[PDB]
Design a protein around this ligand. Structure first.
Ligand SMILES: [Mg+2]
Ligand SMILES: [Mg+2]
Ligand SMILES: [Mg+2]
Ligand SMILES: [Mg+2]
Ligand SMILES: [Mg+2]
Ligand SMILES: [Mg+2]
Ligand SMILES: [Mg+2]
Ligand SMILES: [Mg+2]
Ligand SMILES: [Mg+2]
Ligand SMILES: [Mg+2]
Ligand SMILES: [Mg+2]
Ligand SMILES: [Mg+2]
Ligand SMILES: [Mg+2]
Ligand SMILES: [Mg+2]
Ligand SMILES: [Mg+2]
Ligand SMILES: [Mg+2]
Ligand SMILES: [Mg+2]
Ligand SMILES: [Mg+2]
Ligand SMILES: [Mg+2]
Ligand SMILES: [Mg+2]
Ligand SMILES: [Mg+2]
Ligand SMILES: [Mg+2]
Ligand SMILES: [Mg+2]
Ligand SMILES: [Mg+2]
Ligand SMILES: [Mg+2]
Ligand SMILES: [Mg+2]
Ligand SMILES: [Mg+2]
Ligand SMILES: [Mg+2]
Ligand SMILES: [Mg+2]
Ligand SMILES: [Mg+2]
Ligand SMILES: [Mg+2]
Ligand SMILES: [Mg+2]
Ligand SMILES: [Mg+2]
Ligand SMILES: [Mg+2]
Ligand SMILES: [Mg+2]
Ligand SMILES: [Mg+2]
Ligand SMILES: [Mg+2]
Ligand SMILES: [Mg+2]
Ligand SMILES: [Mg+2]
Ligand SMILES: [Mg+2]
Ligand SMILES: [Mg+2]
Ligand SMILES: [Mg+2]
Ligand SMILES: [Mg+2]
Ligand SMILES: [Mg+2]
Ligand SMILES: [Mg+2]
Ligand SMILES: [Mg+2]
Ligand SMILES: [Mg+2]
Ligand SMILES: [Mg+2]
Ligand SMILES: [Mg+2]
Ligand SMILES: [Mg+2]
Ligand SMILES: [Mg+2]
Ligand SMILES: [Mg+2]
Ligand SMILES: [Mg+2]
Ligand SMILES: [Mg+2]
Ligand SMILES: [Mg+2]
Ligand SMILES: [Mg+2]
Ligand SMILES: [Mg+2]
Ligand SMILES: [Mg+2]
Ligand SMILES: [Mg+2]
Ligand SMILES: [Mg+2]
Ligand SMILES: [Mg+2]
Ligand SMILES: [Mg+2]
Ligand SMILES: [Mg+2]
Ligand SMILES: [Mg+2]
Ligand SMILES: [Mg+2]
Ligand SMILES: [Mg+2]
Ligand SMILES: [Mg+2]
Ligand SMILES: [Mg+2]
Ligand SMILES: [Mg+2]
Ligand SMILES: [Mg+2]
Ligand SMILES: [Mg+2]
Ligand SMILES: [Mg+2]
Ligand SMILES: [Mg+2]
Ligand SMILES: [Mg+2]
Ligand SMILES: [Mg+2]
Ligand SMILES: [Mg+2]
Ligand SMILES: [Mg+2]
Ligand SMILES: [Mg+2]
Ligand SMILES: [Mg+2]
Ligand SMILES: [Mg+2]
Ligand SMILES: [Mg+2]
Ligand SMILES: [Mg+2]
Ligand SMILES: [Mg+2]
Ligand SMILES: [Mg+2]
Ligand SMILES: [Mg+2]
Ligand SMILES: [Mg+2]
Ligand SMILES: [Mg+2]
Ligand SMILES: [Mg+2]
Ligand SMILES: [Mg+2]
Ligand SMILES: [Mg+2]
Ligand SMILES: [Mg+2]
Ligand SMILES: [Mg+2]
Ligand SMILES: [Mg+2]
Ligand SMILES: [Mg+2]
Ligand SMILES: [Mg+2]
Ligand SMILES: [Mg+2]
Ligand SMILES: [Mg+2]
Ligand SMILES: [Mg+2]
Ligand SMILES: [Mg+2]
Ligand SMILES: [Mg+2]
Ligand SMILES: [Mg+2]
Ligand SMILES: [Mg+2]
Ligand SMILES: [Mg+2]
Ligand SMILES: [Mg+2]
Ligand SMILES: [Mg+2]
Ligand SMILES: [Mg+2]
Ligand SMILES: [Mg+2]
Ligand SMILES: [Mg+2]
Ligand SMILES: [Mg+2]
Ligand SMILES: [Mg+2]
Ligand SMILES: [Mg+2]
Ligand SMILES: [Mg+2]
Ligand SMILES: [Mg+2]
Ligand SMILES: [Mg+2]
Ligand SMILES: [Mg+2]
Ligand SMILES: [Mg+2]
Ligand SMILES: [Mg+2]
Ligand SMILES: [Mg+2]
Ligand SMILES: [Mg+2]
Ligand SMILES: [Mg+2]
Ligand SMILES: [Mg+2]
Ligand SMILES: [Mg+2]
Ligand SMILES: [Mg+2]
Ligand SMILES: [Mg+2]
Ligand SMILES: [Mg+2]
Ligand SMILES: [Mg+2]
Ligand SMILES: [Mg+2]
Ligand SMILES: [Mg+2]
Ligand SMILES: [Mg+2]
Ligand SMILES: [Mg+2]
Ligand SMILES: [Mg+2]
Ligand SMILES: [Mg+2]
Ligand SMILES: [Mg+2]
Ligand SMILES: [Mg+2]
Ligand SMILES: [Mg+2]
Ligand SMILES: [Mg+2]
Ligand SMILES: [Mg+2]
Ligand SMILES: [Mg+2]
Ligand SMILES: [Mg+2]
Ligand SMILES: [Mg+2]
Ligand SMILES: [Mg+2]
Ligand SMILES: [Mg+2]
Ligand SMILES: [Mg+2]
Ligand SMILES: [Mg+2]
Ligand SMILES: [Mg+2]
Ligand SMILES: [Mg+2]
Ligand SMILES: [Mg+2]
Ligand SMILES: [Mg+2]
Ligand SMILES: [Mg+2]
Ligand SMILES: [Mg+2]
Ligand SMILES: [Mg+2]
Ligand SMILES: [Mg+2]
Ligand SMILES: [Mg+2]
Ligand SMILES: [Mg+2]
Ligand SMILES: [Mg+2]
Ligand SMILES: [Mg+2]
Ligand SMILES: [Mg+2]
Ligand SMILES: [Mg+2]
Ligand SMILES: [Mg+2]
Ligand SMILES: [Mg+2]
Ligand SMILES: [Mg+2]
Ligand SMILES: [Mg+2]
Ligand SMILES: [Mg+2]
Ligand SMILES: [Mg+2]
Ligand SMILES: [Mg+2]
Ligand SMILES: [Mg+2]
Ligand SMILES: [Mg+2]
Ligand SMILES: [Mg+2]
Ligand SMILES: [Mg+2]
Ligand SMILES: [Mg+2]
Ligand SMILES: [Mg+2]
Ligand SMILES: [Mg+2]
Ligand SMILES: [Mg+2]
Ligand SMILES: [Mg+2]
Ligand SMILES: [Mg+2]
Ligand SMILES: [Mg+2]
Ligand SMILES: [Mg+2]
Ligand SMILES: [Mg+2]
Ligand SMILES: [Mg+2]
Ligand SMILES: [Mg+2]
Ligand SMILES: [Mg+2]
Ligand SMILES: [Mg+2]
Ligand SMILES: [Mg+2]
Ligand SMILES: [Mg+2]
Ligand SMILES: [Mg+2]
Ligand SMILES: [Mg+2]
Ligand SMILES: [Mg+2]
Ligand SMILES: [Mg+2]
Ligand SMILES: [Mg+2]
Ligand SMILES: [Mg+2]
Ligand SMILES: [Mg+2]
Ligand SMILES: [Mg+2]
Ligand SMILES: [Mg+2]
Ligand SMILES: [Mg+2]
Ligand SMILES: [Mg+2]
Ligand SMILES: [Mg+2]
Ligand SMILES: [Mg+2]
Ligand SMILES: [Mg+2]
Ligand SMILES: [Mg+2]
Ligand SMILES: [Mg+2]
Ligand SMILES: [Mg+2]
Ligand SMILES: [Mg+2]
Ligand SMILES: [Mg+2]
Ligand SMILES: [Mg+2]
Ligand SMILES: [Mg+2]
Ligand SMILES: [Mg+2]
Ligand SMILES: [Mg+2]
Ligand SMILES: [Mg+2]
Ligand SMILES: [Mg+2]
Ligand SMILES: [Mg+2]
Ligand SMILES: [Mg+2]
Ligand SMILES: [Mg+2]
Ligand SMILES: [Mg+2]
Ligand SMILES: [Mg+2]
Ligand SMILES: [Mg+2]
Ligand SMILES: [Mg+2]
Ligand SMILES: [Mg+2]
Ligand SMILES: [Mg+2]
Lengths: 110, 77, 139, 141, 203
RNA sequence: UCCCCCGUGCCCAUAGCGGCGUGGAACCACCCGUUCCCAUUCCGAACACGGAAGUGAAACGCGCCAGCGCCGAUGGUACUGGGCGGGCGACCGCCUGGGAGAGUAGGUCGGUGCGGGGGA
RNA sequence: CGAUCAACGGAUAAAAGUUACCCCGGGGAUAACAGGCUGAUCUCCCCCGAGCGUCCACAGCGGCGGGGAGGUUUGGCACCUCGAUGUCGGCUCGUCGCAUCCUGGGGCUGAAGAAGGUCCCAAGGGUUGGGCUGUUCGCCCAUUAAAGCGGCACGCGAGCUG
RNA sequence: CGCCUCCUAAAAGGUAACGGAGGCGCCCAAAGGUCCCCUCAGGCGGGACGGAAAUCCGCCGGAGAGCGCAAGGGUAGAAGG
RNA sequence: CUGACUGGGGCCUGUAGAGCACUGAUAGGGCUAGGGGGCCCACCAGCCUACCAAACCCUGUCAAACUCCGAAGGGUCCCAGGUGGAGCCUGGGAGUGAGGGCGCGAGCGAUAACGUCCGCGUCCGAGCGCGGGAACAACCGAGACCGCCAGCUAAGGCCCCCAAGUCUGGGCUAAGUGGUAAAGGAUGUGGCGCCGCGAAGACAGCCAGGAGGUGGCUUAGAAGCAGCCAUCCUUUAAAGAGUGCGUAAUAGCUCACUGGUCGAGUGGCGCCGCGCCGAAAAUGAUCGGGGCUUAAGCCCAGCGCCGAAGCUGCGGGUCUGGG
């Protein structure tokens, strides 16, 4: 017995995995937001970023954008340029969108 | 006395066409099937009739993933 | 149609057909030993298509001859009970002048036409039933 | 007599009679059993004649268990047709029986009664039979 | 009460040769051991017809050991109706699931009225200690009419023995007898010809 | 490199059902709101945003339990590639090599890769 | 774009019957007769013993089922024969089988006797004349010890009949 | 009489008979493309007209529904709404 | 050198078998809708079941078009062995496109056909050349280049026809079984194995008794042989309220039974052997014949021999290859 949340999660992720690009996964809790860039071909996380690790503070949307910029900076340092956005169970909107936009501003390619 | 039967359709010659370990070129049909008895794996596309074919030159590999199904892959050479 | 009373006679048919009529028998000719009815056919070429019609017409006479002897028995009986003497004869006469319901079998006359020709009467048949015991019993 | 109340298909290929029974080889209900010693298609006519043979011996009393069921249709072309023109019509049903099957079982009855009833029933069947009584080997199954 | 049976170890001997020599191949095992054995056929038959799977059989091994076992499985030759293999379950101090004979005490009143006592279970599955194995379990069937039934819930269990089947499991029933008076209606009973289940645009 | 939690993968029920117990510092959840972005064929349930008074009740995580589900030998057999025989046949045997399924003993209330936050 | 070219690789744009008045080329690659293989059907004999037979399963019977025999029926197959194997019935002449119609011997009998029933042995000889019908078959008349059943290319047309 | 599905087909493919069973000669301007969102049948209990079955509520539920039509394969980690 | 075939390794499969998780089938229970029949009722509720009977469950089963399972095998690829009247590639020339028997797997048929239609194989076809099978295309043996008055074998055989043992060791069968068949029947006969019953003397014969209450649902007058319902008990063996003659009245004989006798084993399963009945068709019979009985039959174990156009020896021909 799965839920709409797990089904929606499998649905969007399976489609992402199929293109073979490195995936930018985003987890969004009530307080924080987390992002890890994953090589599903080895099952390994390459670069990480989160509000909980950056001690970010204020408005959730502006916070997300900043963790997005941070993830980009650390990614480019590793030669990671092209990526595929994994919105998971979340609509592309608000905080998740902000993180994506922040990642793009940093030169991350998608 | 007569028959109300006597009909049958042409055999369709479905099945796997390239077995695990076989050297294929991009485009080689790997499996002919009805529905997804095998699912497309790495470097394997699927046509509108569920046909699996190689996307790259390489070697065929099969994999049984339980409830996730059986997959056909091509490993580049 | 049960077989213990049937002797079936086979042999060659009679008429056109060529060398097949000459050689192959194919003329079934059954004989129903208890009733005596003999229905015998040669119409289709096979004696087994001929066996079918032979059996299917023996029944049509085993049933016809029994239904006769039973309806011949139904008219010999009924003709006696009703009696052609329906001018004035056998059982009872019902007076509507003076109400004398009488049965000439015994004699017993009474005025119960009101209670009989307007209802039941199971007790006024009793003497006709009782006088008919002592009719048989005493002799 | 015995025949399926309904079926998915009217007519059935004949198949084969290889080997000992798949199952049903041990006494499972009554005290004595009638075991088949050679393979055959057993007709519902034969089954019911064996049954009637047993109840008419018991006269009143006992319990008979029939452990084979004729679900296989038997086909025969009309007399005097030639080959072809399709499969013949269903004329009856048979129970496929192979060596070792317990076909009938009796209970509630003395030994001599059980021996005699099953013997007479064996005479109504187209195969050699053997009378057996319940064993620990049977209970252990 | 308790039976003894000389057993012997086997290794590479072919089972066919053993049985042609009058020896019944077998295996003896539990969670600690597993050994290929064989016993003399006629000797085992004398024991098993009494012991069945209900009473303990101790195996007198050639190395001097003596192990208490229960017969756990007997494979029958389907054709010849003869045993070809035995599983001996080596018993130990732990409680064990096993089958215990049912003794149907009394004559059912339905039987007095002409009925028949159908003995659905002649034993019952039970968890119990090997030191605690009863010989039977009595059951009072004299109250059963045609057609009444007893279940495993109605079983009075002795001390230290625990029912291992659902108490809903029926264990006996008193059924109506066979009767020639019914033959006449059964022979003149007409059967409706079998209906074929529809396929395609019919279903 | 150890313990807890949060992500995300692998094995594809030995991982599930049920029952019980446990956890809110942290994390996660409910939770508070519905101004704003966004949303309901009605409904802030969901989706979404802004929040932090409360609660681990639900959910989730972590334990324990074998009633169910799942897994499951070892023996022996069926069947059989090849080789032979027997029977008038329906069919039955022998040799050599392979070898089930059901059942029995038993096994299981998961294991593991990566990256986070926390703890020693 | 125009195909029930649906006989769906679709001979013409355009097409049904009859021949006993018949013809040729072929085939025993393929039917009808006979044989053969088979034995479903046919005949006969067994197995079981439900029940009948006032009583009594088996004098005589034999429910439902079971196993055979034969190769006389009608079929199945298409194996020799289509550069020919003449077919029904009758006549003539037989010969053989025995599952025996008579006669001879015998067992049981619900065998008093006489006459029967049934079963065993037995194939030596015998087994009538007529009416009807092309008939085989069958019905009928008058008899009889009896009025047997089958095989032989349903014996027999280089013997006849037609 | 052509085409499809299943079997006979003897675990690759293929495989005959006047063998066993069913369908096709269409359909859809959305019943198509792409994004997003949603999960069924059935069973039990609750519920005005209202029932075996309208709609509503709750619990149980891996797919036995649905997928335009035959059958098969496939399928809710959608191909279904 | 890539071939058929073979070794290893990977993968593909849903058959045999088996199973019942699905589709259906399914007997017998349990449990329980729905009806049915019976109660009490219509006040609408209320009770019975051994009638039928959905689901569900248990026991027990079935299936080409059912599968939770699932072989042996097969296919295909890779590396290897494999130099063969092998393989690939391109051209020239065909013939064939009526097949048949056998073994196995099925369908059809009737678990009929010297039947029919497929699959795998095989042989005939074309090996109607050779040895065996009495004779006989396809069963067994065996692929004939020619010559030999040399040898070794194959199937099959070794008493005579008729080449080779009237060979050797232990059995079985009296039916000429062998030398032509089924259900089923039968103290034929021969083995094993395993239970009963057996010292207050058995089975079989002689001997003495073998009774008393003596009637019932009870009657077509028969307590006991008349149809049932009957099965109590006793006169200090303890002898039926009854199996065979009279009976819609009785005798009397008889067993089961008890004792007395004379002086030694008896019955039952199960596996196996070999025989018996069941067993009737048409020109004259017969296993090929003659003939065969501790076999000249059958089973087991042995040594030897005969036996072909197979193999060897010797000589020759021709082609190919190698010198
Ligand atoms: Mg939320
Ligand atoms: Mg038709
Ligand atoms: Mg067909
Ligand atoms: Mg067609
Ligand atoms: Mg085809
Ligand atoms: Mg085809
Ligand atoms: Mg097909
Ligand atoms: Mg395949
Ligand atoms: Mg498509
Ligand atoms: Mg496509
Ligand atoms: Mg692998
Ligand atoms: Mg790969
Ligand atoms: Mg005429
Ligand atoms: Mg003509
Ligand atoms: Mg004819
Ligand atoms: Mg068939
Ligand atoms: Mg039959
Ligand atoms: Mg048939
Ligand atoms: Mg015809
Ligand atoms: Mg014909
Ligand atoms: Mg046909
Ligand atoms: Mg048929
Ligand atoms: Mg029938
Ligand atoms: Mg069977
Ligand atoms: Mg029989
Ligand atoms: Mg079982
Ligand atoms: Mg985690
Ligand atoms: Mg707590
Ligand atoms: Mg919890
Ligand atoms: Mg907290
Ligand atoms: Mg707190
Ligand atoms: Mg607002
Ligand atoms: Mg604002
Ligand atoms: Mg708050
Ligand atoms: Mg909690
Ligand atoms: Mg969650
Ligand atoms: Mg298992
Ligand atoms: Mg094993
Ligand atoms: Mg084999
Ligand atoms: Mg066979
Ligand atoms: Mg083997
Ligand atoms: Mg082996
Ligand atoms: Mg298997
Ligand atoms: Mg297993
Ligand atoms: Mg678990
Ligand atoms: Mg849990
Ligand atoms: Mg994990
Ligand atoms: Mg990994
Ligand atoms: Mg950390
Ligand atoms: Mg046109
Ligand atoms: Mg049409
Ligand atoms: Mg055409
Ligand atoms: Mg045309
Ligand atoms: Mg077309
Ligand atoms: Mg055409
Ligand atoms: Mg075509
Ligand atoms: Mg044409
Ligand atoms: Mg044209
Ligand atoms: Mg044209
Ligand atoms: Mg034109
Ligand atoms: Mg025309
Ligand atoms: Mg035309
Ligand atoms: Mg013309
Ligand atoms: Mg004319
Ligand atoms: Mg004319
Ligand atoms: Mg003229
Ligand atoms: Mg003229
Ligand atoms: Mg004219
Ligand atoms: Mg002319
Ligand atoms: Mg001509
Ligand atoms: Mg011409
Ligand atoms: Mg000509
Ligand atoms: Mg011919
Ligand atoms: Mg032709
Ligand atoms: Mg012909
Ligand atoms: Mg003809
Ligand atoms: Mg002809
Ligand atoms: Mg003909
Ligand atoms: Mg003919
Ligand atoms: Mg002729
Ligand atoms: Mg001829
Ligand atoms: Mg002839
Ligand atoms: Mg013949
Ligand atoms: Mg016959
Ligand atoms: Mg015959
Ligand atoms: Mg014959
Ligand atoms: Mg017949
Ligand atoms: Mg006979
Ligand atoms: Mg008899
Ligand atoms: Mg009588
Ligand atoms: Mg009598
Ligand atoms: Mg009687
Ligand atoms: Mg008789
Ligand atoms: Mg009869
Ligand atoms: Mg028969
Ligand atoms: Mg003939
Ligand atoms: Mg004839
Ligand atoms: Mg014919
Ligand atoms: Mg004929
Ligand atoms: Mg012909
Ligand atoms: Mg011909
Ligand atoms: Mg032919
Ligand atoms: Mg001709
Ligand atoms: Mg000529
Ligand atoms: Mg000529
Ligand atoms: Mg001529
Ligand atoms: Mg001539
Ligand atoms: Mg005679
Ligand atoms: Mg005489
Ligand atoms: Mg006489
Ligand atoms: Mg006399
Ligand atoms: Mg007299
Ligand atoms: Mg006499
Ligand atoms: Mg006699
Ligand atoms: Mg006699
Ligand atoms: Mg004579
Ligand atoms: Mg004579
Ligand atoms: Mg004569
Ligand atoms: Mg005359
Ligand atoms: Mg005349
Ligand atoms: Mg005449
Ligand atoms: Mg005249
Ligand atoms: Mg006539
Ligand atoms: Mg007349
Ligand atoms: Mg006279
Ligand atoms: Mg006389
Ligand atoms: Mg004559
Ligand atoms: Mg004829
Ligand atoms: Mg004749
Ligand atoms: Mg003639
Ligand atoms: Mg004649
Ligand atoms: Mg003539
Ligand atoms: Mg003539
Ligand atoms: Mg002549
Ligand atoms: Mg002539
Ligand atoms: Mg002449
Ligand atoms: Mg002539
Ligand atoms: Mg004339
Ligand atoms: Mg004329
Ligand atoms: Mg196929
Ligand atoms: Mg297939
Ligand atoms: Mg295939
Ligand atoms: Mg195959
Ligand atoms: Mg192909
Ligand atoms: Mg159609
Ligand atoms: Mg859309
Ligand atoms: Mg629902
Ligand atoms: Mg409701
Ligand atoms: Mg309501
Ligand atoms: Mg409702
Ligand atoms: Mg579906
Ligand atoms: Mg439809
Ligand atoms: Mg090479
Ligand atoms: Mg190769
Ligand atoms: Mg190769
Ligand atoms: Mg290989
Ligand atoms: Mg099978
Ligand atoms: Mg099932
Ligand atoms: Mg089961
Ligand atoms: Mg089967
Ligand atoms: Mg099966
Ligand atoms: Mg199949
Ligand atoms: Mg299958
Ligand atoms: Mg398994
Ligand atoms: Mg394999
Ligand atoms: Mg292979
Ligand atoms: Mg391989
Ligand atoms: Mg090589
Ligand atoms: Mg060559
Ligand atoms: Mg060649
Ligand atoms: Mg070369
Ligand atoms: Mg040339
Ligand atoms: Mg040339
Ligand atoms: Mg040609
Ligand atoms: Mg031909
Ligand atoms: Mg052809
Ligand atoms: Mg052919
Ligand atoms: Mg062939
Ligand atoms: Mg021949
Ligand atoms: Mg063959
Ligand atoms: Mg075959
Ligand atoms: Mg087939
Ligand atoms: Mg038959
Ligand atoms: Mg043929
Ligand atoms: Mg044949
Ligand atoms: Mg055949
Ligand atoms: Mg052909
Ligand atoms: Mg030729
Ligand atoms: Mg040859
Ligand atoms: Mg050849
Ligand atoms: Mg020849
Ligand atoms: Mg010869
Ligand atoms: Mg010779
Ligand atoms: Mg020959
Ligand atoms: Mg020869
Ligand atoms: Mg030859
Ligand atoms: Mg040569
Ligand atoms: Mg020599
Ligand atoms: Mg030799
Ligand atoms: Mg000789
Ligand atoms: Mg000599
Ligand atoms: Mg000697
Ligand atoms: Mg004799
Ligand atoms: Mg002889
Ligand atoms: Mg003889
Ligand atoms: Mg016998
Ligand atoms: Mg016999
Ligand atoms: Mg004997
Ligand atoms: Mg004997
Ligand atoms: Mg009485
Ligand atoms: Mg004999
Ligand atoms: Mg000797
Ligand atoms: Mg020689
Ligand atoms: Mg020589
Ligand atoms: Mg040579
Ligand atoms: Mg030389
Ligand atoms: Mg040379
Ligand atoms: Mg050469």
């Amino acid at each position: 017995r799965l839920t709409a949340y797990e089904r929606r999660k499998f649905r969007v992720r399976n489609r992402i995995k199929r293109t073979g690009r490195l995936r930018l996964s985003v987890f969004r809790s009530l307080k924080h937001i987390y992002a890890q860039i994953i090589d599903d071909e080895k099952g390994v996380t390459l670069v990480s970023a989160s509000s909980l690790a950056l001690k970010l503070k204020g408005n959730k949307t502006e916070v997300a954008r900043q963790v997005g910029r941070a993830l980009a900076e650390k990614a480019l340092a590793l030669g990671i340029k092209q990526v595929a956005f994994d919105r998971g169970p979340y609509k592309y909107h608000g905080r998740v969108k902000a993180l994506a936009e922040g990642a793009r501003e940093g030169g991350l390619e998608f | 006395g007569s028959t109300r039967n006597g009909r049958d359709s042409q055999a369709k010659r479905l099945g796997v066409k390239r077995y695990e370990g076989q050297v294929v070129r991009a485009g080689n049909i790997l499996v002919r099937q009805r529905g997804t008895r095998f699912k497309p794996g790495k470097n394997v596309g699927m046509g509108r009739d569920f046909t699996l074919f190689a996307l790259v030159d390489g070697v065929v590999e099969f994999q049984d993933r339980g409830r996730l199904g059986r997959y056909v892959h091509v490993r580049p050479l | 149609i049960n077989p213990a009373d049937l002797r079936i006679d086979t042999f060659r048919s009679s008429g056109a057909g060529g060398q097949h009529v000459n050689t192959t028998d194919s003329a079934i000719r059954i004989t129903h030993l208890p009733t005596g009815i003999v229905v015998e056919c040669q119409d289709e070429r096979s004696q087994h298509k001929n066996k079918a019609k032979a059996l299917s017409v023996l029944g049509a006479r085993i049933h016809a001859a029994e239904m006769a002897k039973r309806q011949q028995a139904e008219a010999s009986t009924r003709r006696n009970l009703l009696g052609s003497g329906d001018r004035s004869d056998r059982n009872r006469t019902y007076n509507f002048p003076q109400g004398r319901v009488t049965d000439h079998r015994i004699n017993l006359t009474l005025y119960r036409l009101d209670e009989v020709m307007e209802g039941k009467l199971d007790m006024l048949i009793e003497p006709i039933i009782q006088e008919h015991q002592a009719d048989q019993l005493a002799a | 007599m015995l025949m399926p109340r309904r079926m998915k298909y009217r007519k059935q290929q004949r198949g084969r009679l290889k080997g000992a029974t798949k199952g049903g080889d041990y006494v499972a209900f009554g005290d004595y059993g009638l075991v088949a010693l050679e393979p055959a298609w057993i007709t519902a006519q034969q089954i019911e004649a064996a049954r009637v043979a047993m109840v008419r011996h018991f006269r009143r009393g006992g319990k008979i268990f029939i452990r084979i069921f004729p679900d296989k249709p038997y086909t025969k072309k009309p007399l005097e047709v030639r080959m072809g023109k399709g499969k013949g019509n269903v004329e009856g049903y048979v129970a496929v029986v192979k060596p070792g099957r317990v076909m009938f079982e009796v209970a509630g009855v003395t030994e001599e009664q059980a021996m005699e009833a099953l013997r007479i029933a064996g005479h109504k069947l187209p195969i050699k039979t053997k009378i057996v009584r319940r064993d620990a080997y049977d209970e252990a199954q | 009460m308790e039976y003894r049976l000389k057993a012997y170890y086997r290794e590479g001997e072919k089972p066919s040769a053993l049985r042609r020599a009058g020896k019944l191949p077998g295996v003896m095992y539990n969670r600690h051991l597993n050994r290929k054995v064989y016993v003399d056929l006629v000797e085992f038959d004398k024991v098993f017809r009494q012991a069945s799977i209900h009473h303990v059989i101790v195996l007198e091994l050639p190395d001097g050991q003596s192990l208490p076992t229960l017969v756990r499985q007997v494979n029958l030759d389907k054709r010849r109706r003869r045993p070809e293999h035995v599983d001996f379950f080596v018993l130990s101090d732990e409680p064990v699931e096993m089958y215990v004979p049912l003794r149907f005490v009394g004559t059912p009143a339905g039987v007095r009225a002409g009925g028949v006592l159908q003995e659905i279970h002649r034993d019952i599955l039970v968890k119990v200690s090997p030191r605690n194995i009863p010989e039977f379990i009595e059951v009072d069937v004299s109250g059963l009419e045609i057609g009444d039934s007893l279940h495993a819930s109605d079983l009075k269990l002795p001390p230290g023995v625990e029912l291992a089947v659902s108490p809903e499991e029926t264990i006996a029933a008193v059924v109506p007898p066979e009767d020639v008076e019914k033959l006449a209606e059964e022979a003149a009973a007409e059967v409706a010809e079998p209906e074929v289940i529809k396929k395609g645009k019919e279903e």
